[PDB]
Symmetry: D2
Subunit: 97 residues, 4 copies
């Protein structure tokens, strides 16, 4: 009933893989993150500094999953890591938006 983190990754990989262009390179992917993080940063100041929030959040989560798959990293396993610690043209852009 509730998606396994590993599946959200799979889903996002199905999508990107359909363009037969692979994922954005790490540095490009970073720009993507800063980008969406800037749009999310706008809405948060909009609503708390004077279903948009949900979408501006998903947008970052998307990029974050992309970057994860792009480096063959399990977002789940990465989450466990962090938790453990606390307890102790060349542009194929036709591919995303």
């Amino acid at each position: 009933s509730d998606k396994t983190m590993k599946d959200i990754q799979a889903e996002v990989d199905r999508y990107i893989g359909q363009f037969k262009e692979g994922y954005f390179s790490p540095l490009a992917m970073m720009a993507r993150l800063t980008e969406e993080l800037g749009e999310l940063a706008r809405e948060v100041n909009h609503r708390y500094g004077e279903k948009s929030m949900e979408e501006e959040i998903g947008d970052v989560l998307f990029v974050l999953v992309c970057l994860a798959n792009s480096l063959d990293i399990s977002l789940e396993e990465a989450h466990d890591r962090v938790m453990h610690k606390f307890n102790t043209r060349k542009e194929e852009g036709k591919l995303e938006h």
Copy 2:
């Protein structure tokens, strides 16, 4: 038998934050918190696949911890606003390959 669900990850975080009297951060504080960990993630990739000098240290789990931190903070910002990441995910996967 079974792996971790996105809902459980959000819940896990909330049970963790819930044992602190302070609780969650405000949206604007949480935001600065997020761009902080992003910068570290950025610093790392610039070293591993970027143009800063290649580390001496052999391949580790640095990239995962640096990504796990952004994911953490993002989850924190999501719980604090009663937002379901699983559901937010379906959004993009809808407006995209509609």
Copy 3:
């Protein structure tokens, strides 16, 4: 001889701000505003020099938006951007 100094760019801005008379933004609100323009700049860079074209803007302007907000924060916190600079340039050159 008439090139705009740094000390007066902050000055020209402080003057523009003292019009609205509602003060500069709070450091955290200001920070949010900064990352907003930065990712806006990121959007262009990824378009003109990256691998992701933009939808729906001069490169020069996007940098200016960031320089503006950067200055605003610097001013609100009574900071000399010029001094800040030389401090930085000193770390790079001093102590070998």
Copy 4:
């Protein structure tokens, strides 16, 4: 001796000019900013040298401009003009 924006840019150009690598390509430069933005963000959270963490973001920002022949002065004027005109 009081510094003009161009001068500052030039001074920075001379530093980067000392080494072979030169300026980082735009996407690498973009990540430098994001890196120094995180650190500045940390201080502003922790408090609300601020002069140091702000100087860093200003340094990288200048580098990017130098590597793309952008005059920060002209940039600052276009952005100022926008605020004025309407």
